[PDB]
Amino acid sequence: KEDRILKVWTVDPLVKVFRDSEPVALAEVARGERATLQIVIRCAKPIQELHAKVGPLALGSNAKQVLESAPVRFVGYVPVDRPIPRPPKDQLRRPPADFPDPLLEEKTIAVDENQVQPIWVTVAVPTNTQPGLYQGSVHISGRVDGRQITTKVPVAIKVFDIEVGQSRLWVTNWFSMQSRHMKIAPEPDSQQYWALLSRYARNMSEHRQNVVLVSPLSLATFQLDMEVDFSRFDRWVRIFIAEGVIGRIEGGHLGGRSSDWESPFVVRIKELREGNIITKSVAPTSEEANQFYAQFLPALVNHLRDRGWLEKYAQHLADEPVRTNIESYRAISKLVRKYAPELKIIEACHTKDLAGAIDVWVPQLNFLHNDFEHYQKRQRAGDEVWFYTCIYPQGEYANRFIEQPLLKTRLLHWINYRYGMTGYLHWGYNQWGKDSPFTHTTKQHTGQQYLPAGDPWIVYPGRDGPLDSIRHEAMCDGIADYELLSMLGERDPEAAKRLVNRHVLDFDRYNCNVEAFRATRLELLELLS
């Protein structure tokens, strides 16, 4: 006894806890938000069978009014072996190091001696929850050198009388339908395939994603005697509607680069060749491109209109146009404008010189900063402007890299509010490679640069569906923050400016002080309640 005492403390969930962190639970939320509590343990001896149970979280005026807690999850660690090449000053530690990120879904875990272990508690608070102060405890148990150890940790959730429903922010995370590294491996069109697709869709809507990228080329079949069959595309759309994502439908890219970074764009077509439908890439000004798109685009518009989906849809042309391939990009736009004038066009862009060619602009964050007057004008002209991050920007800009403070993920959506950008895009929902994402955090193809840890995936492969990361949680919370700030700004625009300006000081400069952030959140909640 003494070496068996369990050290327990509570840490703000915006603070990343490392295996060697030193010791230091209340959450404050609107109805409609998710409350997170992070409870951290350490023991001088190994622990077997660590388990936590959330007791009833009850209203003091009425023990009958209880919040429903999700199953408890354990914070998992991943080896970040190589760093962001241009890191921020506030980089949490220098690689190589083990960082907290995946939220594991295990009933029990082992802890090695002297290793700090976070326990992550999520309480989703429905909009119809009665406001007030909910209290209870988390019962932690396990076995240390024979003996059963146990402790209860007091926790409290204050539920403010303000309702956050759907966030008006548009959010897309590009998703690949794949079961790599899972304990299941469904084939396409199997029941389990569609069940997994549903589980992914639910995970996305539970994290306030309300846009999904679906390809009308890849998920259609063609007969070319043209007849287009959209039945697989439709199954996807109905799943994403039913699980509460759609929202909007983001049509997959029609084309891409012919070769290298500055090469011209080509567009995919379908052709009948020797009895088979083949796909090939052609110049957008070609007769082959004109013949295909003159039939495919009207078929797509008719289909969407007939299904009541046309006003929810926007079509991608080709990703990340730059100044040197602008002509071929615009030639793709001309095809769409000609055969499908009713279709809205969306693009993740670098070049700004696309007025009339696209309707939903998605500049990379640093390009938005640099070309801000351009993008404000496009909004005045009636276009939508969102933004993205990826491998870039690095430096001091906000992003969702594992090396960054977790507030840099959450404050992405404060950048949306401050600057009036009405959506956010990211390529990297679940782009796992052939190596495990748990043990190989810096994805890399041979002869090209590695991706910083955090960039290609924000969820991890569980046994039969996605596991969240702590960054997925922070992203969801930021999307709810944007809705709160938007509700405030309708009543009191000056108070919403003051609050956002506390944390978003410029495009590339923030206040990530977690205590300051909590005091801002509380003022927001108090002003709105």
Residue numbers in the entry: 27 to 50, 55 to 255, 260 to 563
Reproduce the article's own wording on this structure.
Beta-N-acetylgalactosaminidases (β-NGAs) hydrolyze the different β-GalNAc linkages of various glycans to modulate the length, combination, and abundance of glycans. Despite low sequence similarity, the crystal structures of these enzymes demonstrate that all enzymes share a prototype structure and have diversified their substrate specificities (oligosaccharide-releasing, oligosaccharide/monosaccharide-releasing, and monosaccharide-releasing) through the accumulation of mutations and insertional amino acid sequences. The overall structure of these enzymes is similar to that of CpNga123 and BvGH123, which consist of a β-sandwich domain at the N-terminus and a (β/α)8-barrel domain encompassing the catalytic region. Among Groups 1–4 and GH123, the DE motif is located at the same position, suggesting that these enzymes adopt the substrate-assisted catalysis reported for GH123 MR-β-NGAs.
